[PDB]
Amino acid sequence: VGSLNCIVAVSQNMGIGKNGDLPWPPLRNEFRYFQRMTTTSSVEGKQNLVIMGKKTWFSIPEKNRPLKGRINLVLSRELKEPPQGAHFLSRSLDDALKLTEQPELANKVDMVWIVGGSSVYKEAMNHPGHLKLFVTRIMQDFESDTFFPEIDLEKYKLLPEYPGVLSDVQEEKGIKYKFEVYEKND
Numbered sequence: 001v002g003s004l005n006c007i008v009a010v011s012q013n014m015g016i017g018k019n020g021d022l023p024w025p026p027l028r029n030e031f032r033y034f035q036r037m038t039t040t041s042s043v044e045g046k047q048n049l050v051i052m053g054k055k056t057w058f059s060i061p062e063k064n065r066p067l068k069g070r071i072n073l074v075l076s077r078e079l080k081e082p083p084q085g086a087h088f089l090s091r092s093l094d095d096a097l098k099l100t101e102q103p104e105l106a107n108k109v110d111m112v113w114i115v116g117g118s119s120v121y122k123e124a125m126n127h128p129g130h131l132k133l134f135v136t137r138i139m140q141d142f143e144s145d146t147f148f149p150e151i152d153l154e155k156y157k158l159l160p161e162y163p164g165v166l167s168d169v170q171e172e173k174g175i176k177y178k179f180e181v182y183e184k185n186d
C-alpha cells in the first residue's frame with residue numbers, strides 16, 4: 001500500500017459542509033480536481049482506496065457513488081454492512097488501515113485518500129507518521145455547520161508546488177480558490 005493522504009475543500013472560516021452539502025455553490029472544476037487526484041494511481045494493476053464517514057458517503061450525489069475507479073470504504077459503527085454501492089465497511093480508521101494490509105486488499109490498493117468528514121480528518125491529522133493534506137482554499141467565508149480541524153503548521157509544511165496541482169488562483173461562479181499540498185512526517 002502506498003501513501004496516506006487527506007483531501008478537502010475548505011472556506012476561509014474553515015467550513016466544509018452545511019446540512020450534508022457543500023457550503024458554496026457547486027464548483028465543477030473543483031470536483032473534477034477531487035476526482036482526478038483521488039483516482040489517479042501511479043502503480044499498475046492497483047486502484048486507490050477512498051475512506052469516508054457515513055455522512056460523507058450519503059452526501060455524494062448518487063450518480064457519482066461509489067466513486068468510480070476507486071475502492072470505496074465507509075466508516076460507521078451503526079451500519080451492519082456496507083451501504084448499497086459501497087465496497088467495504090470498517091468501525092474505526094485504524095481498522096480500515098489494517099484492512100488494507102489483509103490478503104484481500106494488500107496487493108490491490110495503491111494510494112489511500114481520506115475524503116471526509118471532520119472526525120476522521122482530525123484523527124488522521126494527529127496520528128504519527130507520513131501524511132499529506134491536499135487542501136483547496138475557497139477564498140471567501142461561507143455559512144457552515146461542519147469544519148476542518150486545525151492544521152498545525154509546525155508539523156505540516158506547505159509545499160512550494162506539486163506535480164499535477166495548479167499553483168495559480170482559480171475562479172468559478174465568481175468564487176476564487178487555490179490548491180495547496182501540505183506534508184508532515186512525524
Ligand SMILES: NC(=O)C1=CN([C@@H]2O[C@H](COP(=O)(O)OP(=O)(O)OC[C@H]3O[C@@H](n4cnc5c(N)ncnc54)[C@H](OP(=O)(O)O)[C@@H]3O)[C@@H](O)[C@H]2O)C=CC1
Binds near residue numbers: 052059078115
Ligand atoms: N468540503 C469538503 O471537502 C467535504 C465536505 N463534506 C461535507 O462535510 C460534512 C461531513 O460531515 P461529518 O459530520 O464530518 O461526517 P462524516 O462523513 O465524518 O460522517 C460521520 C458519521 O460517520 C461515522 N464515523 C465517522 N468517523 C468514524 C470513525 N473514525 N469510525 C467509525 N465511524 C466513524 C459515524 O457514523 P456512525 O454513527 O454510524 O457510527 C458518524 O456519525 C457534510 O456536510 C458533507 O457534505 C464531506 C467531505 C469533504
